[PDB]
Design a protein around this ligand. Structure first.
Ligand SMILES: Nc1ncnc2c1ncn2[C@@H]1O[C@H](COP(=O)(O)OP(=O)(O)NP(=O)(O)O)[C@@H](O)[C@H]1O
Ligand SMILES: Nc1ncnc2c1ncn2[C@@H]1O[C@H](COP(=O)(O)OP(=O)(O)NP(=O)(O)O)[C@@H](O)[C@H]1O
Ligand SMILES: CC(C)(C)OC(=O)NCCCC[C@H](N)C(=O)O
Ligand SMILES: CC(C)(C)OC(=O)NCCCC[C@H](N)C(=O)O
Ligand SMILES: [Mg+2]
Ligand SMILES: [Mg+2]
Ligand SMILES: [Mg+2]
Ligand SMILES: [Mg+2]
Lengths: 258, 258
């Protein structure tokens, strides 16, 4: 008669936001299975692009076209970078770090390598310096509804002239309107949060800030970090962020357990 | 008078393959510094694309256009995958593994996640199944001239019909001729090596092989794994592979220590 909780969970795995009682679980399941196999077949026959890779390519084109230099830096970084970012056992992030060997860890954010590039590039490039990076970041997390331990961050920034809150809000606005994602910027160094309902899409700041000194900066700057899986989650109306993650269980939000 | 070894090393860092005695080190260094800053300035003014990201986009287009589905799977994987790949303390790879926590490690290759996708996709996609992935892989290494501990692999494969050595060699050939990289395929499951002089660009195999059973495959297949930094090294004539790596020290092969 009524579906068990386990049966509902199984069907939800197979349910797409798009899909719109009376028959047994086996029938409902068979219907969804056929639809999902069909979705995978269309992808294979036409586009063949992975959502996360495609979004990265689209974001890359957006920033490159706007004068930002594309950076690809190490994912495995020196543990020293963590403390240098002012992350001490006093903060939350301290215990979210995935350590590797005795001297390294998986980057929990992009900031350290971008600070290094801002400093080095200032010796060669004209003001202002505009750069960005998109790539894997890692953090141990307790939540699984809005967080992934392995996620992908976009972090863009500009240093020198034009580093105003107005310019920062303008970039964020053109960016999200380009992607077609609804948002609200909330605020009051100057820090702002880009929200979609109760979900944080990004954290942005208008420097300078005291931390800059440790990385040898000394110029004004603006920047923002966005989670690509959160952007995909909102854009594709995925109930659980796992549908937008690097995974062996979902492909473009479609269950691979068919 | 004569340049010291340390001075020559400094100048080599600043030397580009392109560049073509009498004056002091300071003069030679100043000349190279100005040229390198100019190279960075042109990149910033025009293209703005990172070599490794651009190569990945170019390789992605090549395989997607040829009917291969783009995969983005986890970089942080279960340690169990390593043993399941038949990697025991008897092999070299066993000690090259970067372990994370007690149950995970950084993927040293793409094969495990691709085996999983081949098995799952066979329940939904028409024969033959063609997929590929490009992404970070990690291995502890002793060499630094041809190896990086953090590198990027391309692994494409096809399972089902058409999985012949001839088709495999044909894909490799069209691929490298598309990129403009000279090579030689050497061989005799069936295993082949794609070489550029004494440098291994890729290892490819024509299945089936005994290992397949552990991942639930049971169909013929062909595949090959390429190192993107090695491809860049050959294409741009970089003497040391570090110029092609994710790094804070080189950008598109140009030293960032100016
Ligand atoms: N664990 C995660 N999984 C997915 N996305 C994340 C994760 N952590 C951070 N992000 C994304 O990266 C952006 C910038 O990182 P950060 O400002 O450090 O997030 P946070 O402050 O840790 N956010 P939160 O944990 O939701 O309160 C966030 O706004 C998210 O879009
Ligand atoms: N440490 C590394 N650094 C850069 N590229 C690598 C590295 N290891 C493997 N590759 C690339 O990935 C391809 C496939 O990996 P694999 O066949 O496992 O290499 P291998 O057999 O370990 N090669 P090698 O170490 O040079 O004898 C290699 O042909 C290289 O192009
Ligand atoms: C300039 C840089 C890269 C150091 O920072 C920024 O560009 N923007 C700040 C984003 C902060 C995101 C996240 N809250 C973090 O702490 O990294
Ligand atoms: C089918 C699959 C992905 C399991 O393997 C291949 O597609 N090709 C073999 C490539 C081997 C590269 C490297 N030698 C490794 O062992 O992963
Ligand atoms: Mg957090
Ligand atoms: Mg935040
Ligand atoms: Mg090796
Ligand atoms: Mg090999």
């Amino acid at each position: 008669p009524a579906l068990t909780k386990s049966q509902t969970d199984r069907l939800e795995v197979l349910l797409n936001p798009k899909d719109e009682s009376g028959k047994p679980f086996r029938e409902l399941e068979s219907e969804l299975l056929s639809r999902r196999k069909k979705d995978l077949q269309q992808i294979y026959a036409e586009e063949r692009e992975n959502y996360l890779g495609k979004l990265e390519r689209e974001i890359t084109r957006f920033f490159v076209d706007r004068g930002f230099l594309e950076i690809k830096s190490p994912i495995l970084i020196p543990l020293e970078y963590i403390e240098r970012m002012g992350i001490d056992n006093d903060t939350e992030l301290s215990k979210q770090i995935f350590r590797v060997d005795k001297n390294f860890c998986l980057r929990p954010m992009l900031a350290p390598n971008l600070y290094n590039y801002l400093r080095k590039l200032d010796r060669a490039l004209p003001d202002p310096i505009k750069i960005f990076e998109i790539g894997p970041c890692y953090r141990k997390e307790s939540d699984g509804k809005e967080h992934l331990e392995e996620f992908t961050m976009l972090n863009f920034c500009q240093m020198g002239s034009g580093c105003t809150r107005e310019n920062l809000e303008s970039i964020i606005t053109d960016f999200l309107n380009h992607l077609g994602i609804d948002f609200k910027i909330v605020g009051d160094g100057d820090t702002l949060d880009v929200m979609h309902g109760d979900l944080e899409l990004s954290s942005a700041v208008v420097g300078p800030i005291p931390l800059d000194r440790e990385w040898g900066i000394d110029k004004p700057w603006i920047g923002a970090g966005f989670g690509l899986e959160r952007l995909l989650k909102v854009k594709h109306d995925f109930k659980n962020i796992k549908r937008a993650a690097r995974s062996g269980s979902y492909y473009n939000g479609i269950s691979t357990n068919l």
